Design a protein around this ligand. Structure first.
Ligand SMILES: [Zn+2]
Ligand SMILES: [Zn+2]
Ligand SMILES: [Zn+2]
Ligand SMILES: [Zn+2]
Ligand SMILES: [Zn+2]
Ligand SMILES: [Zn+2]
Ligand SMILES: [Zn+2]
Ligand SMILES: [Zn+2]
Lengths: 375, 375, 375, 375
């Protein structure tokens, strides 16, 4: 007997596959954490030492990508007792999240990019995929290397920068500071091979998107690198958000904000407004002040259920659109060559199994792989 | 005999209590520096080892809170010989001051936040309550830790920042510098549990409050965190001040400025203008260039005497309004659970006794507790 | 009815009291989180609105002081997945800990004193008493203000500095670097009113205590300011620690180290060697596998049960000796005027209730007060 | 037809395999750049879309690991015209190198770690495996983040630090400076999951290894973290290196130094001296006249051909010993789960093909994959 177990051959058979594109009943073959074949009727003996998983009657789709999570904890706005705890592995996986982007909020005094970076690396080791944004609400940005441009270019896991505008907790940044920061992230992304995006936490100020428009007139960063998040937090903002997307921008809807514009509602409206799903993303703001991750899946459910979306479409904002926006190669789509990050769900869209890089992380809706110190 | 002296039981009996609210003839019971009961006819034997103080015929009210004092000394505008000496404990207590906020002025070359911080701590130890503002006239601010946001968040006694505008002694700050500073103080306050205010020394420039209005358009700091002081220094300024308060702001009147708008006059006008007393505070600018603290009590006297104010109202600007403005928990009001900071006065409003945190500091109008090196 | 509930009057009746000193059956009267009277037969009606607790049959002693806890998490020695999580309130209280000293270890790259400071403050707000050490294994120290002297002098919660020597995880400090750091801690503590100690993490190097001796020859910091910890980790080091104690130093034994010198054994041997318990402390290294706090109570039990120590003596290293070494005023002993940090145990030394600053935190061995984010 | 080409299945058939361990005629099955099976007679049809390679008559061994290459160029010692050019991909692969460690030398003024880091990353993207050392001859080290500890801990590709001693091109470091740097590297590696080594360029000073011995007496960094290189440069130094190895250290012989101790001779003598091959490595100093990489293969050949070493043994210093010293997971040995970095040679030890991460890089002794700018 020759041992071929090192390959981790796994054949996922019989599910209705949503790539996110609907592919009907189709098989998925994996090896070494990667999707090596996607086709109907793959032979169960095509490769030696194969784990065969019968998924007939179930749905198979890409794992979710949540680009807005306070991995190391957040909060602190009402004093020290309000600092939230770091996020546990199992909380992400049970919610269907296989790829995450960590960031900081208001507090960048007791919270540091170096800590965020360590946590990011820990999660990668524990089995999922993670990246981070440098900076925090504060502008000028507090970085690891002392320069936004340098953090993005040199720190492997950093893909862009975070900031806050139009919010009572911002640093009152002027146009020049915002432009220069955005431009540094853009340039750093080019040199490091990162999307080099600038993510804007939006608050309730009546100035709404104004600062972004101002920025665009004061620099040459492409519109496609600027991401306003929390856009559903207030009406005028949301509306302004729709115009910004119409101009070529991408907008991030927050799943944890249920009023005045609910997440599913926002997504539907955007589509009805003529914005392609490719320019609409959804994120949780998980572990902030603790917001959980269940609203992600719930949004999907609502879209299909109450908004006439097909399952395919409903998945885009959490899969292909994000991956596309952040240029996350090998993520968000079920194609040969991509990472084996997959969800197994019931036809009613309840999570049964989660695989990350080909490893079974959750079974029967329960994490079977946990963080190092998870209790 | 069981010894219960550790509790410092003290029963203040028979005075006419102004909480500041008029409560008629009512008793106050104290233990461990705190007000534990407020009611008419408390039994003199309700607790063992009780010091009973008969205050019949007298008035009992909250200790004053002076939020503008140059604790370590100030001056220096006419050269080195004009640097004033540090403030002595007894000078505060004899004037009815039990809580103070220290700050710097023009000079932040020979004067340092670190020194101010030490003095602040010394006074706390000597028996009263004290806090400070970081910064000074100079903008950008000279701080302890190098960041306004960090000083406010991390240094326990620091509650906000000071600055100078519209004055021939300012640092010619631009809007951006002012906004960013204000925003840092605001954010630092949230993280440290401090009011996170910005205090503006106002000078005689015709620009008057303009810079503040400008700031508000350039940032999202709430109006309620911005405090213009010395507003009675000139007419147009005072008038502008009234409008600012009408918009939701709080204004600080300086007791030591007698012309062209006297302190009592300013307070009366503000009320007549429709501004609630809650948004009017009074401070001394004591020990600056040496201004004393007697004008505090005098203002109160004048308000009642010549302006038709009730005693209750007359006290607000030195007690409940300040405490409220700076979120000084346990101060400015006589309620169970609050600190036993109290004044004992004659019906004509002359100070007889002062208790700070339950300790008798002044008796028969004379300090009976003095600073460590007081002579 | 007059309300006197603000006082929080609590009478703990008829327990056998170990102060730690055996006081026999004795009562304890608490107000405002302070012990106000200790005596036999305190009249259940001596003060109004008094909560009376029948402790008959129980034991009463002071709350434990654990001076070596990784409050924000530690670890990291085997990569990022090894970073432990922050400490939760209930874990401390259930272990009988009412006062803690937080510190950093090996990792001072992903762990920062500012974070530690915030966590310290949260714990105080949550109900217990907490302080911290600046620095970490690294020498020269990583500090908050840029200076060890300045940190100790001006940051309220900071009481000294931490370092590592004779360990393969050290920074290879030379004597000057160590001496300067200890001297700074010392001076900063006089200025700030702190003990100004230097705590040395000891590793397994054969050099053992040598660097300490070297240090003493190169400076004038008193031996009573120098704390070697983890002394029970190896025999030869342990034996040198006894001589160190013999000369006037205090030694800290780690409860989480079982071999080669168990904690109880450690303490027993010190006593056999003629060392006064006043110079021996016991700490957990909690949250540093992943260290818990049960070993503290365990040690006390073992000493009484297998070693013939009296309860009083057994208690010293966790109470009076610690308070004594760190000059923690109001802690470690049950006396009028001290803080109401108490343990109620069964005659078999099992914890039933815990009071921290006069508040019931644990009842029937289970936390009834939890950290803000505890689930 | 189902497409399984994404797996990149490759079966290397019938070569005589040296793992380095002699495994006789044995097959190797590769998928996704990983070795998934090693066994005699693997069925040519065991997996679909399999490329089968007849290696009958050939030799198969692991790709070389060269841990001492001046990836961005070196030189500069005789003025600016002496700055050598950067290394080109094909030069490494044709020499049998599939994993490299880049470092700086004398010049750290016109040469920077940021440049080195970029080049390292380009090489990984181009097809091979590359890491680097921070620092350079200069002590204190010139680093990327300002700290040696921080560089090793947080920059993914950094595995330790370089320095120079006993050489007229040194910075005249004293022992403290060296000890601190080694300790930082050590600690940073635990945190970052890196070997955390210190590599010492040795020159011709009569002091030879002394500074290393001094160091060990002044710190607790393990001897297994200290790498003296260029040990064959002089006799007396060489002889001391043997004793060093004898004590548990590993020594690095330079392939480009022919006299007075030739590389093969060097390795032979170590063996004669009783040193296990595990503690002897061979590196090129390539790109540092201007050093090439042919000396690596040359050495192996000479050892077999003129010295009676077995092929397996001859291979160790370039493969398993290096991987072993640097903890390079997945490298240096042919085992299932390891990376598919392989050399196919003629029985006369002439390189025919090279696979790096399962990709054919060299065919018929000539590169078929070149650097982006190779012409
Ligand atoms: Zn946000
Ligand atoms: Zn957020
Ligand atoms: Zn002023
Ligand atoms: Zn002033
Ligand atoms: Zn330790
Ligand atoms: Zn520790
Ligand atoms: Zn060299
Ligand atoms: Zn070299």
């Amino acid at each position: 007997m020759i041992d071929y177990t090192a390959a981790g051959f796994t054949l996922l058979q019989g599910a209705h596959l949503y790539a996110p594109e609907d592919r009907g009943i189709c098989d998925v073959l994996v090896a070494n954490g990667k999707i090596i074949a996607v086709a109907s009727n793959i032979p169960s003996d095509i490769v030696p030492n194969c784990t065969v998983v019968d998924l007939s009657g179930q749905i198979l789709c890409p794992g979710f990508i949540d680009q807005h999570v306070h991995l190391i904890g957040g909060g602190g706005e009402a004093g020290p007792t309000t600092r939230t705890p770091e996020v546990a592995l199992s909380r992400l996986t049970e919610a269907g999240v296989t790829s995450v982007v960590g960031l900081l909020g208001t507090d960048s005094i007791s919270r540091h990019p170096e800590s965020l970076l360590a946590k990011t690396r820990a999660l990668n080791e524990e089995g999922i995929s993670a990246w981070m944004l440098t900076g925090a609400f504060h502008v000028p940005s507090r970085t690891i290397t002392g320069s936004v441009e340098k953090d993005v270019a040199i720190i492997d896991r950093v893909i862009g920068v975070k900031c806050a505008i139009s919010d009572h907790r911002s640093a009152a940044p002027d146009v020049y500071h915002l432009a220069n920061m955005a431009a540094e992230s853009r340039v750093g992304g080019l040199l490091g091979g990162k999307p080099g995006v600038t993510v804007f936490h939006m608050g309730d100020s009546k100035k709404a998107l104004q600062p972004i428009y101002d920025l665009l007139e004061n620099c040459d960063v492409p519109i496609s690198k600027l991401l306003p998040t929390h856009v559903n937090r207030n009406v005028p903002l949301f509306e302004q958000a729709l115009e910004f997307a119409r101009k070529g921008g991408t907008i991030d809807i927050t799943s944890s904000i249920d009023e005045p514009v609910a997440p599913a509602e926002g997504i539907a409206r955007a589509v009805q407004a003529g914005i392609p799903l490719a320019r609409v993303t959804l994120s949780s703001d998980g572990n902030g002040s603790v917001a959980g991750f269940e609203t992600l899946l719930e949004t999907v459910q609502v879209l299909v259920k109450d908004y006439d979306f097909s399952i395919s479409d409903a998945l885009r904002p959490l899969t292909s659109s994000v991956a596309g926006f952040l240029n996350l190669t090998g993520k968000g789509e079920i194609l040969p060559g991509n990472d084996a990050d997959l969800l197994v769900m019931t036809p009613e869209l309840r999570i049964e199994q989660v695989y990350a890089r080909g490893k079974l992380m959750v079974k029967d809706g329960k994490a079977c792989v946990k963080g190092t110190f998870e209790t």
